[PDB]
Structure 1
Amino acid sequence: MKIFLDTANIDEIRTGVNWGIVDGVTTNPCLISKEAVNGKKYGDIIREILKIVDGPVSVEVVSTKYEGMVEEARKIHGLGDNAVVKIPMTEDGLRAIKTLSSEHINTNCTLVFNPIQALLAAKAGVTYVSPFVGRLDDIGEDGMQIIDMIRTIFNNYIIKTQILVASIRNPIHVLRSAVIGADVVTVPFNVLKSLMKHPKTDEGLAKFLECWKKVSPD
């Protein structure tokens, strides 16, 4: 399972990249606007992420119509070979995805909330589909169940679109994604750093530390 970081915070990205466990980054206009303050510009934030991240970097189009989406996508593509054009699950967005896939431009279909939307994105040739588990949790539906169904549907038809679990809120979203077999998770930095941690790991290290000071004082 690949692990992407779901942020536009450059320090978070650099920190997690340095850890070696970050395979890519996903951004969206809301994540970018949180960082484009006090003089920082949306165009520089995107360019810096692309430079620091060896892996896929998803960048969301802001046009809502087919022609504007395809124009933006080609410019986003031109920013670097690792850029992935993020496009929402809409009729115009499915049209844009089909055109871009035929142009060999990698795409990521976002704002997916049920398995049939994910299937429609895959039928257009999308490289990634991003169902939003946490927003389903927010409205009283276990969001991971949709990941499970998408995984079964994709396996039934040998679909090559990668399942990118998005809107992740806690480490159990991550665990269930891995057990289900989703291709990718994208996580906030606070979730990312918790994944390495466990109280019995800490207790174990102090235990070995005290044992090491018995045979080697220094």
Structure 2
Amino acid sequence: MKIFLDTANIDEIRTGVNWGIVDGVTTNPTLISKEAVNGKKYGDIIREILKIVDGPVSVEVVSTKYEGMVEEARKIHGLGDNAVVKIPMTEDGLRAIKTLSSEHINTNCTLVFNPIQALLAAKAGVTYVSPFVGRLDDIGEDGMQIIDMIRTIFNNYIIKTQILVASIRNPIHVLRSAVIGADVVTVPFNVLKSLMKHPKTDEGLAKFLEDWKKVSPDGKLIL
């Protein structure tokens, strides 16, 4: 399962990549604008992210109409081969995904809330579908069930579109995504960091290191 960092913060990105557990990045104008402070320019942020990240970097199109979407998507693509254009599940979005797929521009269909929407995006040629699980949870539907059904559908037809679990709110979204077999999850840095933690890890390490001092007062390992 790939993990994308949902942020535009370059320090967070570098740190996560160094942990060896970050495979790409998902952005939006809000996340980018957040970093555009103290001299940093909006466009400079996205360009640096595209440069330093080996993997996929998702960038949203703001145009809501077909022509604007494709023209914008082409400009985004021009910024880096690893750019992935984020396009909403709408009639014009599907048309744009079909057109962009033909041009070999990678795409990410967002605002997916049921499995058939996900399937339609895959049929139009989309690279990723991003169902928003936390937003389904918000309205009293278990959002992970939609991920499970999409996984089954995609498996049934050997669909190559990747499931990108989005609107992630907690570590159990991540656990269930992994057990289901979702291709990717995107998570904020704080969620990412929480994924490696457990109180028995902390307690266990403290005990090991206490015991080691019995055999090595300086706490060293000399070999």
TM-score, structure 1 length as denominator? 0.96
The alpha-carbon deviation at position 36 of structure 1 amounts to 2.9
The alpha-carbon deviation at position 39 of structure 1 amounts to 4.3
Q: After the TM superposition, which parts of structure 1 deviate over 3 Å for at least 4 consecutive aligned residues?
A: 37-40
2:111 and 2:40 mapped to 1: Cα distance?
Answer: 27
SS at 2:140 equivalent: coil
The alpha-carbon deviation at position 38 of structure 1 amounts to 4.5
1:181-218 per-residue CA deviation (whole Å, 9 max, x = no partner) reads 00000001110001111111111111110111111111
Which position in structure 1 is the counterpart of 2:18? 18
Query: Which structure 1 segments of 5+ residues have no match?
Result: none
Q: Which moved more, 1:10-19 or 1:190-199?
A: 10-19
1:89-121 per-residue CA deviation (whole Å, 9 max, x = no partner) reads 111110000011111111110111111110110
1:193 and 1:52 mapped to 2: Cα distance?
Answer: 21
Aligned CA RMSD, in angstroms, stands at 1.1
1:123-177 per-residue CA deviation (whole Å, 9 max, x = no partner) reads 1000000000011111111111100110111111111100000010110000000
1:61 and 1:86 mapped to 2: Cα distance?
Answer: 6
The alpha-carbon deviation at position 9 of structure 1 amounts to 1.9
1:60-82 per-residue CA deviation (whole Å, 9 max, x = no partner) reads 11111111111111111111111
Q: Which moved more, 1:144-153 or 1:43-52?
A: 43-52
Q: How many residues align?
A: 218
The answer as to 2:156 corresponding to 1:135 is no
2:107 and 2:78 mapped to 1: Cα distance?
Answer: 13
Computing the radius of gyration from Cα coordinates, the structure with the larger value is: 2
1:135 and 1:11 mapped to 2: Cα distance?
Answer: 28
Identity over aligned residues, as a percent?
99
1:33 and 1:140 mapped to 2: Cα distance?
Answer: 31
SS at 2:201 equivalent: helix
SS at 2:50 equivalent: helix
2:168 and 2:114 mapped to 1: Cα distance?
Answer: 16
Query: Which structure 2 segments of 5+ residues have no match?
Result: 219-223
Q: Which moved more, 1:184-193 or 1:45-54?
A: 45-54
How do residues 1-218 of structure 1 correspond to structure 2 at under 5 angstroms?
A: 1-218=1-218
